[PDB]
Amino acid sequence: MLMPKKNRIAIYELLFKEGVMVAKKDVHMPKHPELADKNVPNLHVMKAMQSLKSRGYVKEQFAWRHFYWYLTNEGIQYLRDYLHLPPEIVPATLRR
């Protein structure tokens, strides 16, 4: 994917803050639904997290028409040392 790295780091920010992420199986979304702020297509989002899951940092589920992605511990390793983030911060699924 010739991905705007802006948008890819933004999707990584969504995955980290809202600790896991859902999307619709729809390459022809005009624009992705979870975020209203940026401009990233659901096609970019889907293939970005397929590139995430192929080397094994996120795990996939598919119900009726929606991809579900769950960020594993190796994924939280890769995501924090990729986003250059110190280990004081944790996802909202880990906050209690």
Binding site: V20, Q61, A63, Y68, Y70
Partner: protein, 114 residues
């Protein structure tokens, strides 16, 4: 509701909500004895009850996976934050649930038992 949905399509819309909720939890927690759900609604928050066998594993370490799939349910269905809550409970008399016994038979066949 300001868009003011009618009652006829309202009951089939939350019926089809409970259907895809049950099928989503079936595709996820089939490894861990997911028996069913019960969805009961109040004003400003909605109690959705997963009813399964291995409650220790549907919670997970510390309760991580329940918070994980509360976030999944809210993000997928467009629920407001903290407006629905997942509670996980134990099957009374585990042997009689044909769902859980079909899944236990399925994992016996997948583990290789004759």
């Amino acid at each position: 509701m300001a868009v003011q949905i009618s009652k006829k399509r309202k009951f089939v819309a939350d019926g089809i909500f409970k259907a895809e909720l049950n099928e989503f939890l079936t595709r996820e927690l089939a490894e861990d004895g997911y028996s069913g759900v019960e969805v009961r609604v109040t004003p400003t928050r909605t109690e959705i009850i997963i009813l399964a066998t291995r409650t220790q594993n549907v919670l997970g370490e510390k309760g991580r996976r329940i918070r994980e799939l509360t976030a999944v349910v809210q993000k997928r269905f467009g629920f407001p934050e903290g407006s629905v809550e997942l509670y996980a409970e134990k099957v009374a008399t585990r042997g009689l649930c044909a769902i859980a016994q079909a899944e236990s038979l399925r994992y016996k066949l997948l583990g290789g038992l004759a």
